[PDB]
Amino acid sequence: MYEFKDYYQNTVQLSFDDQPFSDSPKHVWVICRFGGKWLLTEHEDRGYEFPGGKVEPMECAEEAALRAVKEETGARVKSLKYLGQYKVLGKEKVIVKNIYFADIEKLEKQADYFETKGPVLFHELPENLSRNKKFSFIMKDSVLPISLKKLKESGWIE
């Protein structure tokens, strides 16, 4: 596994095995790709980040991942694939977040933006996200580069 600190100096435990920290994860994170471009969302407070969110009642992690993509980017996933899972050790609460890769089939219109500003398309992600104020803190740690390298080698990009 991988153990490092996040933007707010909280301990993050990253692994690429089939749900090692928890079999019931309360959070999801979806690395989206619309062909040759990265599909991101713009949170009203945080900024630029990959779609994600909490798992709702009578919903599984995979269901929550597809919903978060539609709720934040309004996109339909062609193939959702489990990449890994991470544990964030905060001051009081501990969060178990599931990492998913979504190959985007299409981008459709949305009626409401759930704390978001709609879909965002990037041909290539900026050189330093930890310095970039337009991006979210969830993009400003080692979870993002390690996952992209694993994703690269998966490799389902092509």
Q: Which of residues 99-158 bind ligand GTP (CB under 6 A)?
A: 138, 141
Whether the CB-CB separation of 108 and 74 falls below 8 Å is answered with yes
Residue that is written with structure tokens 């400003």 in the block: 140
Please say which residue, 10 or 132, places its beta carbon nearer to ligand GTP: 10
d(CA 150, CA 111): 35
d(CA 17, CA 26): 17
- Phi, psi values for residue 3, rounded to 5°: -130, 120
Q: Which of residues 22-81 bind ligand GTP (CB under 6 A)?
A: 29, 54
Please say which residue, 39 or 88, places its beta carbon nearer to ligand GTP: 88
Out of 1, 44, 78, 90, which residue is the one contacting ligand GTP (CB under 6 A)? Answer: 90
Whether the CB-CB separation of 88 and 95 falls below 8 Å is answered with yes
97 touches ligand GTP by CB under 6 A: yes
Strands 27-34, 94-107: pairing kind: parallel
**Cβ at position 117, least distance to ligand GTP in Å:** 18
**Cβ at position 118, least distance to ligand GTP in Å:** 20
8 touches ligand GTP by CB under 6 A: yes
d(CA 41, CA 29): 12
Q: Which residues bind ligand GTP (CB under 6 A)?
A: 6, 8, 10, 12, 29, 54, 88, 90, 93, 95, 97, 138, 141
